[PDB]
Every structure is written in structure tokens, then in C-alpha cells.
Amino acid sequence: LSLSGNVLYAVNYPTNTKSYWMYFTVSPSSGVSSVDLSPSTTAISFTAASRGVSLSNIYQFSLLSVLPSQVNNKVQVKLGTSIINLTLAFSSNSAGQTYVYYSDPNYALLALNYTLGQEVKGGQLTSSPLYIISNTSIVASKPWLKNDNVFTFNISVNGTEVEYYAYVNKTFAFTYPVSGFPLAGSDIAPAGSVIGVMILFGPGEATNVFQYETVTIQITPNIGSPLTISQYIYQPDGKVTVIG
């Protein structure tokens, strides 16, 4: 795998007391061959060595497994009387293949919230580490959400800004397709695909922002060389900051 985008880091800017997520993009190197990215076989490690943080595997989920019909029209917004079905997985056709992708990390997050809630509902997963809500009033009835890590993001629906609050139980990573991915259902990144990797921090690693520190991420699939990503992080300069 090659790093095939910038590494983006999000924090509670400007206050910089708390850390939200990292996002980056990967693709198979030099277009030569496909890479298995199944979260059962692959590991993603995360280390901030200066502060003694070292996680040997944070990779839990992939939307590469997920067909558009499993996520589109399955989360919805109540704008007053009106109820709007969201489209989250976009799709296009070439040579009789349907390509699938998520246009941004926000639609990927909502598609994951749905997918993991549906896997909990199906008894396949014990608890989702991610919970996403628009209504904050709910939180008083769910005291476990009080102490875990929370960040917010906005999407637009019927031209209206909808804020979502994402509650994160533990530090975890997920992957989702960004382009060149016709193999929906498979967890395989084919040569000339582009895959988003997103790390959401839990209340442990979130506790204070990375500054004057080296962060290393390593993706190790079951075949082929691992991709090792390292940044020395200066003070973060915006709501999102480009760290590498």
C-alpha cells in the first residue's frame, strides 16, 4: 500500500485539549496487484511513542464489505414534519461494473453507525464502539455516553445544516472506498482503487492533543509489505490540520 493523500488530524480547536480523529487515504502501490484489507486478517497499529501510547491493533470495521443497498435510504432526518432518506454510498458504472464510494468521512461515519447498529441488532457484534445522534437530549438517559469521547460534524439535508454528535467508546480504525472500487462485498482493494482509512480516538488516547510528538501508524495486511506512516506533529492549526 502507498499513502495516496494527505494525513488529516482533527481536534477541539482552538482549545486543543482533546483529540477527535485522523483520516488518510491509501491505494495499492504502483498499480501492480490487489490488497486484502479485511479487519479480521489485517492489523492497523497506532503509536505515539513520546507519551507511551502503543496500540497493536485498532482496525475493526470496513465499508468495503457493505453494498450501497445496505446503507442508502436506511438513515433519515426528521426536518419538522418532513422525513428525508439519506444517500451515503454513491455509485457509478463502467464496463458493466458498479463502482462504490463515500464522498466524505461524514457519510462514511453515518454508514458505519448504521452498519454497526444493524450488526448489534443482528447479534453479530456485542456493542458498537461508535454511536451517532442528532438529538443530544437522549444523552441524559444513556450515562455511558457521558464519559466516552465525543466530536461533532455537520451534513446538509434539504439545504439545512444537521449537526451529528459521534460518541466513541475506544480508539478504533475503519476503512471505506473512495474511488476505483467495484468489488463491493469483498474487503479487497484492487489495483487502481483508493481507500479511505479513518481512526477515531476513544477517551484514553483523546485525553490531550498531539504536540511536539511523533505519531506512527502501520497497516499490515496478511500478504505483502506493511505501510508505515510517521509524522512529527507540530501544534494543530485548525479544526482539521494537515499533519503529513
Binding site: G224, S225, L227, T228, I229, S230, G244
Partner: protein, 49 residues
Amino acid sequence: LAGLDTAIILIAFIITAAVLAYVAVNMGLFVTQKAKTTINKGEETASTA
């Protein structure tokens, strides 16, 4: 026999070369990203004043 033992040295030498391939590709990905970061910091050092 001439091949059986010769087949043992082929298996082993493939694995040995694959181990160098694994290390060289990983460490190339590492160093090229250190270069990317350095190039960015070099521009930032020339622009910021």
C-alpha cells in the same frame, strides 16, 4: 534426489528474497514519506517569516 534437495534450496531462497522484498518496500515507503514531510517543512521554513 538431485531435484528433491534442489527443491529445498529453491523454496528457502524464494523466502529469503521475499523477506528482502518485504523489508525494502516497507522501508522505501517509510523513507519516501520522511522525504515528503521534510520537503513540506523546507517550504514552510522558506515561506514563514
